[PDB]
């Protein structure tokens, strides 16, 4: 059914969008997490210093 | 041909039951062996 | 039998768990995949264990494009549905009548090979474990059994040694006599339980023998070989595999070498308590071709109590 | 060159025995990291 | 006859409602009882 | 010319560096690979920059099985050899006669397409940059030029704008007249240098235009399009690409979206100051196929002074 | 359905213009992480 | 045919030289334009 | 030459050995490094405590 | 004639000694002057 065709097309589009979002966000998320963790580290070492 | 196939299957099941009983009593015979030696 | 009770033997593990310590623990056979794949898991309740999973696999032939899978479990009940792209439904239900007695039913439904139905009843005793399963069971007008029925029995002969057999009855169509085969299984556990040996004289003259050793709390290793047979003269096609697994508070590593020449490793970094990143690479030195695939295990929840527990 | 049907099983059994000995040898223990 | 009709009928019941069975079971057992839409979606609601 | 000197214009970058800010910085075109690949680099001296590299690429068609490559450089001299599996030698030498004047020669040698020889002389002035290169240069008995010769000139019209042309002379065999083509190049830099625009009206009616913007010290983004042309009616085959790059003290991330539908990302984690791990995954939504490859950059040294400097 | 030869260039130019506007828009700035 | 090809190449090079001189003097003419307006 | 054949075979064997060693050691090396880094972390937090 | 002979001769010289040229240059310039075997190998000697 044309409604069925629209449904499956929309589902495929959502799948593509989610896959692309994950592929382009996960590694950036790891990078941001690592940078903020290192910032917290440095802050902790400073707090140790004073 | 079904005759030989059926006979072979039946004998396989009978041997399976025999070994199943063997395993059921295996600790018993092992205990007896340990007592012997 | 009074005099027989003095032995006080321990119940051996179920037949399927014979190679668990090696096949499903220190090897990539189950964990391996290919290409990218993201796994999102949602937790809703813990005391009643309820969960909602998702999957987005691309580039893996075995894996589907998408797979929704909801898992529920309680003290004596366990269920799991698995919707798959192309509306391929997979389901499993495990119900425990008694603490030691559990009946399991698995059903995979699709357009190809419609409705493969498996039902099995598992019994565990003080010293022996018996389980019987029936694949695609049915009845026929002629009244003879149809489908495949398998019964396995495993008895611990001694505390460190358990022997058992696996009976197989198969009948494809029912018109021809249903072929039946028997396989012998053996499981040896060290007195200290440091290392575990398992042997499986499968039917058709195929031997699946493996060894397991716990080097330390973090490192356990095991090997497994195979000796499949054939006929046009006899053809024997076997492989020996050596695998080791390293587990740590932050990551789990699994490596394996194959007699076929292929080498594979599997790393899982728990970057966050929830999020876990998986890497899976393999090489094939015989043909000089490599299989590789990364992944994700995003692990969100949906309840304030669950999130509080997750954060501690 | 013989490559008999028995050759495959003999090779696999030799590999299995060697792997078992290795795993149960002190060498495996030395592999496990001190930390 | 009846038992073979039940075979197919129950196989269809599985095919068409196994996952809904699990979802309903979870949503009923859960004390929060999240809405269906949020429950299905892979997003945290808390 | 005295009155012309008042402008005091800045020297624009060389022609090849026209798209450096985008093509070679905020895109994966150069950094992308496939399958596993390990890169071991050895440092021997710094003031005279000397280095010894190795490569072990498997599963990448573009990459070779092995590649040894030694790089030397000094204040005014730079050389680099590159042995490749199958004894495919690649070499490059850069010699600076003057601070602003440098002559570069590149030579790739193999069994297929033997001895492709490229020599070029680069000149940089206060306001203009000119470089001339000759591909597979040679002479013929008839005395006419043989091989391909390219001359490019780029003059900064204004401090924020530079225009230049690229001349191309090619002659395959020498018997037929050597086809020659001209391309126009434009480079615009914001007064604040926050964003840079580059335009290239390549020959054969192909337009390569790109934009570059520095969002912040960590984030810079850029896009690039292409409008290649053809004839049997005219055929135009172009693609628009959007890419962004995130750089941090511990890792560098690059992402890119393609008008063809493929999506790619490139992450490089500097787990250690020496060791760096690279991940490179791409998707092709048009065909639903994925390219993926991890890597390594093991970064050992060979001198106590170098190691002390490396550790700080 | 037309898919003229000019259609490809028109689409690519539209994409280029949209991308340029986006990159130079405040939205790009908001994308860049605060930290 | 070589006649037309050679003529076209020569004219291309001549036009290239013309535009090269144009670029060489471009800052000059731009300065003049700025003075004009 | 037979010497050439032996040379190339030995080189191929060395390449295979090195590739396998890297593939099976690098991820384990990262795991060991992460575990020891976390151990140092915990030690540092304890030293902070006392 | 001579200049075309030099073309091929120098191309062969490149093919057969370009990398050795770089290696010798580095080993001479380096103050440590590491042995050839260690220099080639991808292992730290310090």
mmCIF file of C-alpha atoms in Angstrom, chain C residues 7-251:
data_model
loop_
_atom_site.group_PDB
_atom_site.id
_atom_site.type_symbol
_atom_site.label_atom_id
_atom_site.label_comp_id
_atom_site.label_asym_id
_atom_site.label_seq_id
_atom_site.Cartn_x
_atom_site.Cartn_y
_atom_site.Cartn_z
ATOM 1 C CA UNK C 7 29.581 -40.727 47.667
ATOM 2 C CA UNK C 8 27.845 -37.330 47.925
ATOM 3 C CA UNK C 9 28.590 -36.310 44.354
ATOM 4 C CA UNK C 10 28.082 -32.836 42.904
ATOM 5 C CA UNK C 11 25.689 -32.134 40.060
ATOM 6 C CA UNK C 12 27.615 -31.599 36.803
ATOM 7 C CA UNK C 13 26.686 -28.759 34.513
ATOM 8 C CA UNK C 14 24.139 -29.166 31.761
ATOM 9 C CA UNK C 15 25.207 -30.751 28.487
ATOM 10 C CA UNK C 16 25.095 -27.477 26.554
ATOM 11 C CA UNK C 17 27.430 -25.865 29.113
ATOM 12 C CA UNK C 18 30.055 -28.550 28.462
ATOM 13 C CA UNK C 19 32.200 -26.193 26.358
ATOM 14 C CA UNK C 20 30.970 -22.959 27.955
ATOM 15 C CA UNK C 21 34.276 -22.339 29.733
ATOM 16 C CA UNK C 22 36.059 -22.420 26.360
ATOM 17 C CA UNK C 23 33.667 -22.014 23.444
ATOM 18 C CA UNK C 24 31.599 -19.182 24.935
ATOM 19 C CA UNK C 25 34.179 -17.685 27.329
ATOM 20 C CA UNK C 26 37.727 -17.798 25.938
ATOM 21 C CA UNK C 27 36.871 -17.628 22.217
ATOM 22 C CA UNK C 28 35.428 -15.140 19.747
ATOM 23 C CA UNK C 29 33.049 -17.618 18.093
ATOM 24 C CA UNK C 30 30.046 -15.887 19.671
ATOM 25 C CA UNK C 31 31.368 -12.355 20.239
ATOM 26 C CA UNK C 32 32.825 -11.874 16.756
ATOM 27 C CA UNK C 33 31.069 -9.671 14.204
ATOM 28 C CA UNK C 34 32.004 -7.617 11.144
ATOM 29 C CA UNK C 35 31.691 -4.003 10.081
ATOM 30 C CA UNK C 36 30.147 -1.323 12.265
ATOM 31 C CA UNK C 37 27.319 -2.175 14.646
ATOM 32 C CA UNK C 38 25.687 -0.094 17.380
ATOM 33 C CA UNK C 39 23.843 -1.703 20.298
ATOM 34 C CA UNK C 40 21.567 0.478 22.435
ATOM 35 C CA UNK C 41 20.226 -1.120 25.620
ATOM 36 C CA UNK C 42 17.497 0.350 27.824
ATOM 37 C CA UNK C 43 16.956 -0.803 31.410
ATOM 38 C CA UNK C 44 13.569 -0.275 33.058
ATOM 39 C CA UNK C 45 13.564 -2.421 36.210
ATOM 40 C CA UNK C 46 16.058 -4.616 38.044
ATOM 41 C CA UNK C 47 14.279 -6.707 40.692
ATOM 42 C CA UNK C 48 11.986 -7.675 37.837
ATOM 43 C CA UNK C 49 14.769 -7.674 35.261
ATOM 44 C CA UNK C 50 13.334 -5.832 32.259
ATOM 45 C CA UNK C 51 15.285 -4.452 29.328
ATOM 46 C CA UNK C 52 14.813 -3.086 25.807
ATOM 47 C CA UNK C 53 17.588 -3.468 23.242
ATOM 48 C CA UNK C 54 18.222 -2.088 19.768
ATOM 49 C CA UNK C 55 20.769 -2.894 17.089
ATOM 50 C CA UNK C 56 22.060 -1.055 14.015
ATOM 51 C CA UNK C 57 24.459 -3.318 12.113
ATOM 52 C CA UNK C 58 25.827 -2.315 8.707
ATOM 53 C CA UNK C 59 28.330 -4.295 6.654
ATOM 54 C CA UNK C 60 27.822 -7.552 8.583
ATOM 55 C CA UNK C 61 26.176 -10.282 6.527
ATOM 56 C CA UNK C 62 25.265 -12.330 9.604
ATOM 57 C CA UNK C 63 23.788 -9.361 11.458
ATOM 58 C CA UNK C 64 20.564 -7.626 10.382
ATOM 59 C CA UNK C 65 20.129 -3.986 9.452
ATOM 60 C CA UNK C 66 17.981 -3.451 12.551
ATOM 61 C CA UNK C 67 16.848 -5.618 15.451
ATOM 62 C CA UNK C 68 14.541 -4.667 18.311
ATOM 63 C CA UNK C 69 14.727 -7.111 21.269
ATOM 64 C CA UNK C 70 12.943 -6.835 24.650
ATOM 65 C CA UNK C 71 14.073 -9.058 27.522
ATOM 66 C CA UNK C 72 12.146 -9.737 30.727
ATOM 67 C CA UNK C 73 13.161 -11.957 33.624
ATOM 68 C CA UNK C 74 12.122 -12.709 37.189
ATOM 69 C CA UNK C 75 13.109 -15.192 39.881
ATOM 70 C CA UNK C 76 11.446 -18.123 38.098
ATOM 71 C CA UNK C 77 10.475 -16.687 34.685
ATOM 72 C CA UNK C 78 12.452 -15.443 31.690
ATOM 73 C CA UNK C 79 11.238 -14.290 28.280
ATOM 74 C CA UNK C 80 12.790 -12.557 25.291
ATOM 75 C CA UNK C 81 11.371 -11.318 22.014
ATOM 76 C CA UNK C 82 13.509 -10.300 19.057
ATOM 77 C CA UNK C 83 12.014 -8.426 16.127
ATOM 78 C CA UNK C 84 14.397 -8.380 13.134
ATOM 79 C CA UNK C 85 14.394 -6.352 9.900
ATOM 80 C CA UNK C 86 12.170 -8.024 7.310
ATOM 81 C CA UNK C 87 9.785 -8.845 10.183
ATOM 82 C CA UNK C 88 11.731 -11.975 11.151
ATOM 83 C CA UNK C 89 10.422 -12.752 14.643
ATOM 84 C CA UNK C 90 12.567 -14.683 17.115
ATOM 85 C CA UNK C 91 11.389 -15.622 20.585
ATOM 86 C CA UNK C 92 12.434 -17.609 23.625
ATOM 87 C CA UNK C 93 10.716 -18.400 26.920
ATOM 88 C CA UNK C 94 12.199 -20.101 29.985
ATOM 89 C CA UNK C 95 9.946 -21.127 32.874
ATOM 90 C CA UNK C 96 11.192 -22.701 36.085
ATOM 91 C CA UNK C 97 8.633 -25.053 37.604
ATOM 92 C CA UNK C 98 11.098 -25.838 40.401
ATOM 93 C CA UNK C 99 14.407 -24.337 41.473
ATOM 94 C CA UNK C 100 16.295 -27.143 39.706
ATOM 95 C CA UNK C 101 13.637 -27.965 37.070
ATOM 96 C CA UNK C 102 13.197 -25.574 34.134
ATOM 97 C CA UNK C 103 11.408 -25.920 30.791
ATOM 98 C CA UNK C 104 12.644 -23.844 27.851
ATOM 99 C CA UNK C 105 10.922 -23.139 24.534
ATOM 100 C CA UNK C 106 12.577 -21.365 21.607
ATOM 101 C CA UNK C 107 10.743 -20.281 18.463
ATOM 102 C CA UNK C 108 12.146 -18.544 15.386
ATOM 103 C CA UNK C 109 9.581 -17.354 12.839
ATOM 104 C CA UNK C 110 10.223 -15.991 9.347
ATOM 105 C CA UNK C 111 9.320 -16.260 5.670
ATOM 106 C CA UNK C 112 12.178 -18.662 4.925
ATOM 107 C CA UNK C 113 11.981 -21.936 6.866
ATOM 108 C CA UNK C 114 8.675 -20.834 8.516
ATOM 109 C CA UNK C 115 8.151 -21.556 12.198
ATOM 110 C CA UNK C 116 11.109 -23.576 13.437
ATOM 111 C CA UNK C 117 9.714 -24.598 16.859
ATOM 112 C CA UNK C 118 11.937 -25.966 19.624
ATOM 113 C CA UNK C 119 10.657 -27.100 23.015
ATOM 114 C CA UNK C 120 12.814 -28.746 25.666
ATOM 115 C CA UNK C 121 12.428 -29.794 29.345
ATOM 116 C CA UNK C 122 15.571 -29.649 31.566
ATOM 117 C CA UNK C 123 16.014 -31.635 34.781
ATOM 118 C CA UNK C 124 18.913 -31.238 37.204
ATOM 119 C CA UNK C 125 19.539 -33.706 40.023
ATOM 120 C CA UNK C 126 22.075 -34.013 42.827
ATOM 121 C CA UNK C 127 24.533 -35.929 40.628
ATOM 122 C CA UNK C 128 23.070 -36.010 37.097
ATOM 123 C CA UNK C 129 21.502 -33.604 34.613
ATOM 124 C CA UNK C 130 19.098 -34.664 31.858
ATOM 125 C CA UNK C 131 17.432 -32.487 29.227
ATOM 126 C CA UNK C 132 15.270 -33.430 26.242
ATOM 127 C CA UNK C 133 14.521 -31.135 23.302
ATOM 128 C CA UNK C 134 12.324 -31.537 20.228
ATOM 129 C CA UNK C 135 13.076 -29.593 17.049
ATOM 130 C CA UNK C 136 10.147 -28.746 14.748
ATOM 131 C CA UNK C 137 7.983 -31.316 16.575
ATOM 132 C CA UNK C 138 4.694 -32.344 15.004
ATOM 133 C CA UNK C 139 2.434 -35.316 14.316
ATOM 134 C CA UNK C 140 1.481 -37.127 11.125
ATOM 135 C CA UNK C 141 -1.609 -38.934 9.894
ATOM 136 C CA UNK C 142 0.359 -42.190 9.926
ATOM 137 C CA UNK C 143 0.953 -41.416 13.614
ATOM 138 C CA UNK C 144 4.730 -41.821 13.644
ATOM 139 C CA UNK C 145 6.854 -39.093 15.183
ATOM 140 C CA UNK C 146 7.851 -36.153 13.002
ATOM 141 C CA UNK C 147 10.635 -33.647 13.472
ATOM 142 C CA UNK C 148 13.880 -33.990 15.391
ATOM 143 C CA UNK C 149 14.008 -35.086 19.034
ATOM 144 C CA UNK C 150 17.204 -35.007 21.105
ATOM 145 C CA UNK C 151 17.699 -36.403 24.611
ATOM 146 C CA UNK C 152 20.931 -35.920 26.558
ATOM 147 C CA UNK C 153 21.970 -37.453 29.877
ATOM 148 C CA UNK C 154 25.035 -36.571 31.947
ATOM 149 C CA UNK C 155 26.020 -38.317 35.185
ATOM 150 C CA UNK C 156 28.971 -37.425 37.410
ATOM 151 C CA UNK C 157 30.885 -40.676 37.856
ATOM 152 C CA UNK C 158 33.241 -39.017 40.355
ATOM 153 C CA UNK C 159 33.446 -35.512 41.836
ATOM 154 C CA UNK C 160 36.183 -34.537 39.358
ATOM 155 C CA UNK C 161 34.809 -36.457 36.362
ATOM 156 C CA UNK C 162 31.441 -36.517 34.597
ATOM 157 C CA UNK C 163 30.460 -38.744 31.671
ATOM 158 C CA UNK C 164 27.324 -38.511 29.575
ATOM 159 C CA UNK C 165 25.758 -39.401 26.256
ATOM 160 C CA UNK C 166 23.605 -37.446 23.816
ATOM 161 C CA UNK C 167 20.848 -39.239 21.907
ATOM 162 C CA UNK C 168 19.613 -37.853 18.590
ATOM 163 C CA UNK C 169 16.448 -38.841 16.705
ATOM 164 C CA UNK C 170 15.833 -37.045 13.370
ATOM 165 C CA UNK C 171 13.121 -37.600 10.770
ATOM 166 C CA UNK C 172 12.936 -35.092 7.930
ATOM 167 C CA UNK C 173 9.758 -36.123 6.089
ATOM 168 C CA UNK C 174 8.420 -39.131 8.016
ATOM 169 C CA UNK C 175 8.105 -41.366 4.955
ATOM 170 C CA UNK C 176 11.663 -42.661 5.288
ATOM 171 C CA UNK C 177 12.908 -44.109 8.584
ATOM 172 C CA UNK C 178 14.146 -41.406 10.920
ATOM 173 C CA UNK C 179 17.916 -41.530 11.259
ATOM 174 C CA UNK C 180 19.129 -41.651 14.862
ATOM 175 C CA UNK C 181 22.618 -41.111 16.235
ATOM 176 C CA UNK C 182 24.378 -41.152 19.587
ATOM 177 C CA UNK C 183 27.285 -39.048 20.839
ATOM 178 C CA UNK C 184 29.486 -39.479 23.906
ATOM 179 C CA UNK C 185 30.465 -36.561 26.135
ATOM 180 C CA UNK C 186 33.042 -36.327 28.914
ATOM 181 C CA UNK C 187 33.893 -33.497 31.305
ATOM 182 C CA UNK C 188 36.869 -33.480 33.674
ATOM 183 C CA UNK C 189 37.395 -30.843 36.369
ATOM 184 C CA UNK C 190 40.594 -30.553 38.375
ATOM 185 C CA UNK C 191 40.340 -31.164 42.109
ATOM 186 C CA UNK C 192 41.355 -27.525 42.592
ATOM 187 C CA UNK C 193 39.102 -26.509 39.659
ATOM 188 C CA UNK C 194 42.087 -24.604 38.256
ATOM 189 C CA UNK C 195 41.689 -26.288 34.859
ATOM 190 C CA UNK C 196 38.756 -28.009 33.169
ATOM 191 C CA UNK C 197 38.892 -30.572 30.361
ATOM 192 C CA UNK C 198 35.944 -31.459 28.139
ATOM 193 C CA UNK C 199 35.668 -34.120 25.463
ATOM 194 C CA UNK C 200 32.863 -34.667 22.973
ATOM 195 C CA UNK C 201 32.838 -37.730 20.713
ATOM 196 C CA UNK C 202 30.117 -36.276 18.530
ATOM 197 C CA UNK C 203 28.201 -38.486 16.109
ATOM 198 C CA UNK C 204 29.462 -39.185 12.531
ATOM 199 C CA UNK C 205 32.944 -39.725 14.056
ATOM 200 C CA UNK C 206 33.575 -36.063 14.894
ATOM 201 C CA UNK C 207 35.654 -35.316 17.998
ATOM 202 C CA UNK C 208 35.401 -31.926 19.710
ATOM 203 C CA UNK C 209 37.928 -31.838 22.552
ATOM 204 C CA UNK C 210 38.899 -28.718 24.485
ATOM 205 C CA UNK C 211 40.880 -27.687 27.552
ATOM 206 C CA UNK C 212 40.425 -24.789 29.961
ATOM 207 C CA UNK C 213 42.802 -23.321 32.533
ATOM 208 C CA UNK C 214 42.468 -20.338 34.868
ATOM 209 C CA UNK C 215 45.950 -18.820 34.937
ATOM 210 C CA UNK C 216 44.815 -16.146 37.395
ATOM 211 C CA UNK C 217 41.781 -14.069 38.302
ATOM 212 C CA UNK C 218 42.382 -11.967 35.173
ATOM 213 C CA UNK C 219 43.775 -14.508 32.688
ATOM 214 C CA UNK C 220 42.212 -17.772 31.542
ATOM 215 C CA UNK C 221 43.171 -19.755 28.449
ATOM 216 C CA UNK C 222 41.863 -22.732 26.524
ATOM 217 C CA UNK C 223 42.245 -24.667 23.296
ATOM 218 C CA UNK C 224 39.878 -26.695 21.144
ATOM 219 C CA UNK C 225 40.303 -29.056 18.198
ATOM 220 C CA UNK C 226 37.972 -30.717 15.712
ATOM 221 C CA UNK C 227 38.184 -33.792 13.495
ATOM 222 C CA UNK C 228 35.140 -33.717 11.214
ATOM 223 C CA UNK C 229 35.047 -36.649 8.803
ATOM 224 C CA UNK C 230 33.736 -37.441 5.356
ATOM 225 C CA UNK C 231 33.627 -39.940 2.508
ATOM 226 C CA UNK C 232 34.067 -39.586 -1.268
ATOM 227 C CA UNK C 233 37.855 -42.213 0.429
ATOM 228 C CA UNK C 234 37.360 -40.675 3.876
ATOM 229 C CA UNK C 235 37.826 -36.914 4.151
ATOM 230 C CA UNK C 236 38.898 -35.437 7.495
ATOM 231 C CA UNK C 237 38.597 -31.600 7.832
ATOM 232 C CA UNK C 238 39.715 -30.401 11.330
ATOM 233 C CA UNK C 239 41.120 -27.307 12.982
ATOM 234 C CA UNK C 240 42.951 -26.649 16.242
ATOM 235 C CA UNK C 241 42.320 -23.333 18.001
ATOM 236 C CA UNK C 242 44.232 -21.723 20.873
ATOM 237 C CA UNK C 243 42.599 -18.845 22.715
ATOM 238 C CA UNK C 244 43.280 -16.695 25.749
ATOM 239 C CA UNK C 245 41.166 -14.065 27.484
ATOM 240 C CA UNK C 246 42.336 -11.137 29.611
ATOM 241 C CA UNK C 247 39.742 -9.452 31.824
ATOM 242 C CA UNK C 248 40.235 -6.210 33.740
ATOM 243 C CA UNK C 249 38.126 -3.706 35.640
ATOM 244 C CA UNK C 250 38.112 -1.438 32.565
ATOM 245 C CA UNK C 251 38.308 -3.800 29.586
#
